[PDB]
Design a protein around this ligand. Structure first.
Ligand SMILES: Nc1ncnc2c1ncn2[C@@H]1O[C@H](COP(=O)(O)OP(=O)(O)O)[C@@H](O)[C@H]1O
Ligand SMILES: [Ca+2]
Ligand SMILES: [Cl-]
Length: 380
């Protein structure tokens, strides 16, 4: 009788929903947010998950883990792991050919497998659901990228189990997104669906072919290292020069400062999605010197123009691999927190014969939404 949940275990954010009495409910965390950072932090006295973990990153960088989704199901020697390792502030060690994240926790050295860090994020999402329903949740459906291999899917499933969940099914994120928009219920002929999924660290384009209720992955393309964080960094480099020009000081060397700026830029970016301008106010950014400035949407767009325009290439590549003209796509689906960027929406719109965009479901909640539906269906 207990309802099962749908969990979108994202690269940088996670989301949980539950299908109740004919509708899907996206559950808010303790801070009232419908998305939770896929972050786990370890201190001298506690282990933080979600917002609390990401909030103290600037003061505890070596022990605040993220991007566990990039390591999960992979080998220590995998070139992807060795490359990614160079960009993380935490240590990744080898354990019988398997990578482990090593940190300082409660006064000592501890190492964790990717699926262990991920199981911690899953527990948080499980408890959020449990507080809402009022009872224990034991069944779930978890999404993963369509390109994930058997090994990556297995480790993710192991994560759900370690989090005390029976994973009813591991499904593809673009499939989950299709389900959210109800493209899995028509049974009349076949239709072409393109999924434009731009998150905080990754960009995925998926072309699916739904023939009378059956899903078929036609093509996939994108960039696993292109996402919202890259837009934040364009803003960061922008303000570093401005601070450098107004107070004559290069802050690019003070780690804590760069981090506090990146966090401010991230929030400024979001404001630029609904307003033409945004203010950036950081107290004692560098050497006690404050930093209050402003920036227009257009300026922001110019700073990321190349990045935004690059998103159309994976789109055209997918169309090619799937041997379809852009006009042959029946359903254009935009998901991911970054598709909220007016500019990103316009580039896609102009590209796709200036067609109308579907604004019926929340882009950063879409994956969890479809997951919840499938979970309920699987639960009878
Ligand atoms: N209103 C917004 N405007 C611009 N970017 C946003 C907005 N809301 C969220 N984002 C961005 O979307 C990204 C988070 O995407 P999301 O799909 O939720 O997670 P994930 O990275 O785990 O896939 C972040 O880079 C975030 O800054
Ligand atoms: Ca996402
Ligand atoms: Cl919470």
């Amino acid at each position: 009788k207990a309802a099962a949940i749908g969990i979108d275990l994202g690269t940088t954010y996670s989301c949980v929903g539950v299908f109740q009495h004919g509708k899907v409910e996206i559950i808010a965390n303790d801070q009232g947010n419908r998305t939770t950072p896929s972050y786990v932090a370890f201190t001298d006295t506690e282990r933080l998950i979600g917002d609390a973990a990401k909030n103290q990153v600037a003061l505890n960088p070596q022990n605040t883990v993220f991007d566990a989704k990039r390591l999960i199901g992979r080998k220590f020697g995998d070139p992807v792991v060795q490359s990614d390792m160079k960009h993380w502030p935490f240590q990744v060690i080898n354990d019988g050919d398997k990578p482990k994240v090593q940190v300082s926790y409660k006064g000592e050295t501890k190492a964790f497998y990717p699926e262990e860090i991920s199981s911690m994020v899953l527990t948080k999402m499980k408890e959020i659901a449990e507080a809402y329903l009022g009872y224990p949740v034991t069944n779930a459906v978890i999404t993963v990228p369509a390109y994930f291999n058997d090994s990556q899917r297995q480790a993710t499933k192991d994560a759900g189990v370690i989090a005390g969940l029976n994973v009813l099914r591991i499904i593809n994120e673009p499939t989950a997104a299709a389900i959210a928009y109800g493209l899995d219920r028509t049974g009349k002929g076949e239709r072409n669906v393109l999924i434009f999924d731009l998150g905080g660290g990754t960009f995925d384009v998926s072309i699916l072919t739904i023939d009378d209720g059956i899903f078929e992955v036609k093509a996939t393309a994108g960039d696993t290292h292109l996402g919202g964080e890259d837009f934040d960094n364009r803003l960061v480099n922008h303000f570093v020069e401005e601070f450098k020009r107004k107070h004559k000081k290069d802050i690019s060397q003070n780690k804590r400062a760069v981090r506090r700026l990146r966090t401010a830029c991230e929030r400024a970016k979001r404001t630029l999605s609904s307003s033409t301008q945004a203010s950036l106010e950081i107290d004692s950014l560098f050497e006690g010197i404050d930093f209050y400035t402003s920036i227009t949407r257009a300026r922001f767009e110019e700073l990321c123009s190349d990045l935004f325009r690059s998103t159309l290439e994976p789109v055209e590549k997918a169309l090619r691999d799937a041997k379809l003209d852009k006009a042959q796509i029946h359903d254009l689906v935009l998901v991911g927190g970054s598709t909220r960027i007016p500019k990103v929406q316009k580039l896609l719109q102009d590209f796709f014969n200036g067609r109308d965009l579907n604004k019926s479901i929340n882009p950063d909640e879409a994956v969890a939404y479809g997951a919840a539906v499938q979970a309920a269906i699987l639960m009878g």
